[PDB]
Amino acid sequence: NDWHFNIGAMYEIENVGLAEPSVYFNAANGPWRIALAYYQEGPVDYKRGTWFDRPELEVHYQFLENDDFSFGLTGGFRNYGYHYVDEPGKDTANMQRWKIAPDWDVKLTDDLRFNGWLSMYKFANDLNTTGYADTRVETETGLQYTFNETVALRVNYYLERGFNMDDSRNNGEFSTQEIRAYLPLTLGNHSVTPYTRIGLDRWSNDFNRVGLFYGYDFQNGLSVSLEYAFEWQDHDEGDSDKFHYAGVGVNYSF
Numbered sequence: 082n083d084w085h086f087n088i089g090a091m092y093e094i095e096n097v098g099l100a101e102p103s104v105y106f107n108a109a110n111g112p113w114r115i116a117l118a119y120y121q122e123g124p125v126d127y128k129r130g131t132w133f134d135r136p137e138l139e140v141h142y143q144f145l146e147n148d149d150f151s152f153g154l155t156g157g158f159r160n161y162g163y164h165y166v167d168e169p170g171k172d173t174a175n176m177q178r179w180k181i182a183p184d185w186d187v188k189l190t191d192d193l194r195f196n197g198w199l200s201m202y203k204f205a206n207d208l209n210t211t212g213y214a215d216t217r218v219e220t221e222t223g224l225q226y227t228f229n230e231t232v233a234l235r236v237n238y239y240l241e242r243g244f245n246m247d248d249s250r251n252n253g254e255f256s257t258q259e260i261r262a263y264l265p266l267t268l269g270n271h272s273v274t275p276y277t278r279i280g281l282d283r284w285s286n287d288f289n290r291v292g293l294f295y296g297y298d299f300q301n302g303l304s305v306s307l308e309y310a311f312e313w314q315d316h317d318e319g320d321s322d323k324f325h326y327a328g329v330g331v332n333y334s335f
């Protein structure tokens with residue numbers, strides 16, 4: 082068919098300070114895609130602190146792609162390379178995440194679709210050290226109403242659950258449910274998307290978030306992105322838990 086290629090880098094920053102540099106490569110031919118990515122996560126001013134890296138191979142097979150029913154499958158591997166700093170009883174960890182994840186875009190009407198993805202994960206080595214449950218389910222699924230070429234509405238249900246399949250393990254058990262809404266504006270070469278997540282019910286061992294993605298394509302294979310988001314848990318009279326996300330990214334296609 083045609084080979085398509087993307088390369089890119091992202092820089093994400095999350096404070097209340099974490100620095101998250103990353104780079105990726107993908108190539109596709111017909112229903113086949115291959116994805117290398119390297120992500121790292123650590124405090125700003127590395128006052129050094131503990132950090133990790135996250136190399137990733139993913140493979141996607143497009144089983145069906147048309148207007149009434151598209152359906153798809155992602156298989157993924159990564160390692161988490163934890164580097165502990167001034168934590169007692171920890172030096173390093175190396176935990177791997179295995180992924181299988183179908184993704185589907187089904188047509189309800191001429192301007193209403195049901196789409197989503199569903200990730201089942203297995204998490205491998207150094208679980209006690211790393212604090213993770215050996216199993217995880219994650220999904221964002223919902224409805225896209227298209228107004229027109231310029232305006233659309235995505236409402237989705239979103240679910241993360243961590244559970245050990247071991248009887249003799251309860252480290253890192255947790256559930257998150259949220260409603261997520263986005264209104265993606267496609268203004269020619271601009272892309273403007275405001276969005277919220279409303280926590281329904283979160284527990285681990287409710288919350289809300291507003292944000293704004295912005296995306297320019299320059300018609301030569303280059304594009305860039307800005308994203309900002311504000312999150313809050315809301316607590317004892319006024320003074321609540323408050324977090325900022327920021328993100329810049331670039332991509333090149335060929």
Ligand SMILES: CCCCCCCCO[C@@H]1O[C@H](CO)[C@@H](O)[C@H](O)[C@H]1O
Pocket residue numbers: 090091092100102103104124125126127
């Ligand atoms: C994938 C490549 C991304 C390159 C972005 C580098 C952005 C700058 O990075 C900043 O440099 C500061 C010094 O001013 C450091 O203290 C911080 O760790 C960092 O936020």
Ligand SMILES: CCCCCCCCO[C@@H]1O[C@H](CO)[C@@H](O)[C@H](O)[C@H]1O
Pocket residue numbers: 117118119134136162163
């Ligand atoms: C697409 C890019 C793939 C890059 C794979 C990089 C190999 C990662 O390997 C890791 O290097 C880290 C950094 O010092 C350490 O956490 C570990 O010693 C090592 O496992």
Ligand code: NA
Pocket residue numbers: 274276294
């Ligand atoms: Na977004």
